[PDB]
């Protein structure tokens, strides 16, 4: 029967929705979209705990400490507004500051039970998404009528209810047989996941802690194992901890878990979740303005790692790799690469690792590896595991995770042949092929590479040919688009200047660079122009038919590299076509790297 407290709380939350008008128009917009475009959006909105705090502290504290009594009223009020304003019940999500209620699996204890929490951690294992039967529909052949039944369980409501275990009906009330109508019944999706403490926050040498989270319907497949995640929900208990019946055993306790309602993926370094920023009109105006200056390439290049002295061409190359070219798919089924790769051979104090770590810190999706750190199955995802359902599955590796991203390799020359043969396919075919006992598949590995290497004799030697100084297979070098050699020669003026620079440090910002790169990569796709065609053809012919001793060979890969660099420079320019200047810049960079 009706309750007075429930109605008073519904009225108060309706007043709250009245005072703030953002959520109202959000609901209107969702309904408008679903009407016009029929894809169907789910019926849900997000509320800020901060605004609730300024509005009604009692209601705020009730939702924080007694969600089982205050949230269903709020959902009913929201549903009432939604039903009144239009020409499924609605649900809520929470953001803002949770204060003392923001915890981790280690610091979540029995004193937080029945309260709304927000946990952080790493996803370790998900489950198979299954349907759950809610309403069945049947047919009687003798009478020509249709029937139905409803089903419920303990996890579909926050407050405890008296069980009503209905049976599945096979007969009629008069004894006649029934037929199931699978198309007219209703099923809802269901999943269960596990969350652990972050590897970068848990104490060292200590076994970790974890907690289970239950998801339903429209939040069923929003994350994958290995992600950094933030989950907001109600920490809850179920059943009887051996209290009912004798149950002499006392070791077990009460089952606990989280009935989740909000899931947020978080970006970190060396992880599979990519960073994205929201672009406002001020940002777009500023970017489109800066696009029209003539030294834009120079400014964007000098912005990279301003703490390092010189290495301007390597900065330009890193920017070009960050932007990238365009990949081609022919109707026949062929694929043409569009990524850019960079290699660095240099002296042992040339700031190679600093630039490598900068690329790790700045790219939206990057994974860091070292020469002997990862090998075997750790690079190509060639490891196999299996479910407790029986099936064997694969789990992603370094380059499989970094699809559509970049990979940083340090101490490149310390690798072996077994993994170099593996990375050949990644760097050219951009695919990974596995053939083990009970598996035959092909995984996409479209990623770019940047690496740093050491000379054979500790320091680069000018009295010997490059082959005696690099000592890497020719077939491997052909797959690197650009190869740079850096040496430190003592010079009084250069030493002086670098000294004052390093002393200055010891006593365009990156976010705008990230916004710029994201917009340029998402929006612009230029095409080839005859002028650039002629320029690149001439340059390729001249390079292929010259007597100069080079740092790397010349093949068709060099021509494709010229095209890729030209297209990436045009992408930087925000132009929809490639001009002569982009081709000339690509040719100049290639010639400088080679000579």
């Amino acid at each position: 029967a009706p309750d007075a407290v429930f109605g008073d709380r519904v009225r108060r939350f309706q007043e709250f929705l009245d005072t703030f008008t953002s959520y109202r128009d959000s609901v209107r917009s969702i309904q408008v979209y679903n009407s016009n475009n029929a894809n169907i959006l789910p019926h849900r909105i997000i509320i800020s705990l901060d605004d609730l705090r300024e509005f009604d502290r009692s209601f705020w504290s009730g939702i924080l400490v007694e969600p089982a009594y205050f949230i269903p009223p709020a959902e009913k009020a929201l549903t009432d507004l939604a039903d009144s304003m239009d020409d499924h019940p609605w649900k809520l999500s929470f953001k803002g500051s949770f204060g003392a209620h923001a915890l981790s699996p280690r610091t979540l204890t029995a004193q937080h039970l029945n309260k709304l929490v927000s946990v952080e951690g790493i996803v370790t294992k998900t489950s198979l998404v299954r349907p759950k039967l809610i309403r069945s529909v049947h047919y009687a052949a003798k009478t020509g009528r249709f029937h139905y039944r409803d089903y419920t369980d303990a996890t579909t409501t926050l407050t405890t209810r008296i069980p009503t275990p209905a049976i599945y009906p096979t007969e009629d009330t008069e004894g006649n047989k029934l037929t199931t109508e699978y198309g007219y019944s209703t099923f809802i999706d269901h999943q269960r996941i596990t969350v652990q403490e972050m590897p970068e926050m848990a104490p060292a040498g200590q076994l970790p802690r974890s907690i289970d989270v239950i998801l339903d319907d429209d939040l069923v497949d929003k994350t994958k194992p290995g992600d950094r995640v933030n989950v907001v929900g109600v920490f809850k208990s179920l059943g009887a901890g051996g209290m009912n019946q004798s149950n002499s055993n006392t070791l077990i306790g009460f089952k606990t878990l989280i009935l989740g309602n909000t899931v947020y993926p978080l970006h970190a370094r060396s992880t599979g979740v990519a960073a994205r920023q929201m672009l406002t009109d001020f940002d777009i105006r500023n970017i489109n303005k800066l696009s029209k200056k003539k030294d834009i390439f120079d400014i964007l290049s000098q912005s990279l790692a301003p703490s390092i002295y010189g290495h301007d061409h390597i900065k330009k190359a890193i920017l070009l790799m960050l932007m990238g070219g365009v990949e081609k798919n022919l109707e026949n089924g062929s694929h043409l690469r569009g990524d850019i790769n960079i290699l660095m051979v240099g002296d042992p104090s040339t700031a190679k690792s600093q630039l490598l770590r900068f690329v790790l810190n700045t790219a939206s999706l990057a994974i860091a590896t070292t020469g002997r750190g990862s090998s075997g199955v750790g690079l190509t995802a060639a490891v196999t595991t299996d479910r407790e359902t029986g099936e064997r599955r694969l789990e992603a590796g370094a380059m499989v995770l970094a699809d559509r991203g970049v990979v940083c390799i340090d101490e490149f020359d310390k690798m072996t042949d077994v993994d170099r043969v593996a990375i050949h396919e990644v760097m050219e075919q951009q695919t990974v092929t596995i053939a083990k006992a009970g598996i035959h598949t092909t995984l996409n590995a479209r990623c770019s590479v940047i690496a740093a290497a050491n000379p054979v004799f500790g320091q680069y030697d000018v009295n010997r040919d490059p082959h005696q100084n690099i000592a890497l297979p020719d077939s491997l070098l052909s797959r690197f688009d650009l190869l740079f050699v850096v040496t430190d020669d003592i010079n009084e003026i250069r030493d002086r200047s670098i000294s004052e620079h390093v002393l200055r440090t010891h006593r365009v910002t990156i976010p705008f660079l990230r916004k710029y790169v994201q917009y340029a990569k998402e929006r612009v796709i230029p095409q080839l122009t005859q002028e650039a065609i002629n320029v690149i053809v001439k340059n390729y012919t001249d390079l292929r038919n010259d007597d100069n001793t080079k740092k790397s060979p010349i093949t068709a890969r060099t021509l494709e590299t010229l095209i890729r660099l030209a297209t990436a420079h045009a992408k930087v320019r925000l132009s929809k076509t490639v001009n002569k200047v982009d081709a000339k810049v690509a040719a100049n960079l290639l010639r400088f790297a080679l000579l």
């Binding site: 042992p348 104090s349 500790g458 320091q459 009084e492 030493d495 002086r496 010891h506 006593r507």
Partner: protein, 166 residues
């Protein structure tokens, strides 16, 4: 033989450290006698009381007190150089690299103990570390003097290298 030859790994590993100490065992009558006297004094038990129990009254610190003081200083202070120290460090670094270049061009071989930027930041860190224990948020040339003296005592014993000779 060069110090690079004396070690059993790539000579570029030596480029990573800030200060190097090649301690040799030279034979000497008086030094041997002094060290022997010290060691037998320690074993007998006089050094257990003498010095250690008398220097704790003003001119020596307890191990626990020193540990706590290191923790305190690490938490509290973080010095930063001054322009005079900066210019002096820059000039010294340039002179050192100039001398090494002259020596290398004087011959056909490369030295086994190279000088790089890492040594510049090494001297910077050393001067700041000396400043810190005094709790001074600022370091003056008096700290750079001692830093350069320590560097010359420790790292610039690369004069034992063959090209460095000159």
């Amino acid at each position: 033989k060069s110090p690079g030859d004396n070690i059993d790994f790539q000579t570029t590993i030596l480029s990573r450290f800030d200060m190097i100490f090649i301690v040799k065992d030279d034979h000497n009558e008086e030094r041997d006698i002094s060290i022997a006297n010290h060691v037998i004094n320690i074993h007998t038990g006089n050094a257990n009381a003498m010095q250690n129990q008398q220097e704790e009254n003003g001119s020596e610190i307890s191990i626990e007190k020193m540990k706590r003081y290191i923790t305190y200083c690490r938490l509290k202070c973080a010095p930063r150089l001054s322009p005079q120290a900066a210019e002096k460090l820059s000039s010294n670094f340039v002179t050192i690299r100039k001398q090494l270049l002259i020596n290398e061009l004087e011959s056909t071989e490369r030295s086994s103990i190279p000088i790089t930027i890492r040594q510049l930041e090494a001297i910077i860190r050393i001067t700041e570390s000396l400043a810190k224990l005094e709790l001074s948020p600022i370091a003056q040339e008096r700290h750079v003097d001692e830093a350069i003296r320590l560097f010359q005592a420790s790292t610039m014993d690369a004069a034992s290298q063959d090209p460095i000779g000159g």
